[PDB]
Design a protein around this ligand. Structure first.
Ligand code: HEM
Length: 291
């Protein structure tokens, strides 16, 4: 496969900035979801799960085809709970029927991070919806019950190296795990709907205790009321990953700069951009626009 980026016919920066402004205004408004966490966390988890099916060996999966819209990917056990992020974005797709599904699912993630006080993420338009038979089979998304060796081997299929993997995993400060979705339960820190380096600081400063939860799965619990997954806890058990965790814990700006670069790379894997294509757009936040 080659997947060439094609701009939605006739659309420019200001059209996309209107879809972003509409996702951000609805984030402001539906602030009660999941005990007042808001939809920001499930929207960046939707943007990474539609991108994480990519396989570098044959160019299949990835964000291009917007295939989550199909039953097979939608009903994938690893995608339980993302139906909430889909339902949120659906009125917005009726308001802007011209934007592709992959472009909308991925911009939902960019909007959520920037509106949660994260770094600016450059975003590129051009994904094209593809047929139901291009939909990737289930089982390409990662297990939580595993170690640092599995994590490194997994992220190599998306050719993400160590620093990219540690920066990307910093998004687990956001939101929480839910027992009925994944068999895990609990938050990862205090500020779980503001984007900060808190995941790293909690992983270095809490007194973590291994326990089984109500689903019979193990997780790392702390006195404070926080939890970490086995794969999260892996980042301080591996010596290469641990020097990077310490770097981000001492420097949130370096974390922002590296998360920005890696999240964009994750959203654009498997897509060729012609050089006639527009440069990546930097969207303004509501606040920047006075809205
Ligand atoms: C080895 C990698 C990863 C594994 C095994 C993993 C696993 C999980 C699991 C089990 C949950 C809880 C789901 C639930 O019960 O609702 C979760 C939540 C979440 N994940 Fe990951 N994750 C990984 C990588 C990432 C990456 C790379 C991102 C983002 C760049 C990400 C973002 C999120 C977000 C934001 C949540 C919170 C969702 C919410 O509050 O509803 N994860 N993850």
């Amino acid at each position: 496969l080659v997947h060439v980026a094609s701009v939605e016919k006739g659309r420019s920066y200001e059209d996309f900035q209107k879809v972003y402004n509409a996702i951000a205004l609805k984030l402001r408004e539906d602030d009660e979801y999941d005990n007042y966490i808001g939809y920001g966390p499930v929207l960046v988890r939707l943007a990474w799960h539609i991108s994480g099916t990519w396989d570098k060996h044959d160019n299949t999966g990835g964000s291009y085809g917007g295939t989550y819209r199909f039953k097979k990917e939608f009903n994938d056990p690893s995608n339980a709970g993302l139906q909430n992020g889909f339902k949120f974005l659906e009125p917005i797709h009726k308001e802007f029927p011209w934007i592709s599904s992959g472009d909308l699912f991925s911009l939902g993630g960019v909007t959520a991070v920037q509106e949660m006080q994260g770094p600016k993420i450059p975003w590129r338009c051009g994904r094209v919806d593809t047929p139901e038979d291009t939909t990737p089979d289930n089982g390409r998304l990662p297990d939580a019950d595993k170690d640092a060796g599995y994590v490194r081997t997994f992220f190599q299929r998306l050719n993400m190296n160590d620093r990219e993997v540690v920066a990307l995993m910093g998004a687990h400060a956001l939101g929480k795990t839910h027992l009925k979705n994944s068999g895990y339960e609990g938050p990862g820190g205090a500020a779980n709907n503001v984007f900060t380096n808190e995941f790293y600081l909690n992983l270095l400063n809490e007194d973590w205790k291994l326990e089984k939860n109500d689903a019979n799965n193990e997780q790392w619990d702390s006195k404070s009321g926080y939890m970490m997954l086995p794969t999260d806890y892996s980042l301080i058990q591996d010596p290469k990953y641990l020097s990077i965790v310490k770097e981000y814990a001492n420097d949130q700006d370096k974390f922002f700069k590296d998360f920005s670069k890696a999240f964009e790379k994750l959203l654009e894997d498997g897509i060729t951009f012609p050089k006639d294509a527009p440069s990546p757009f930097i969207f303004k936040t509501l606040e920047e626009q006075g809205l």
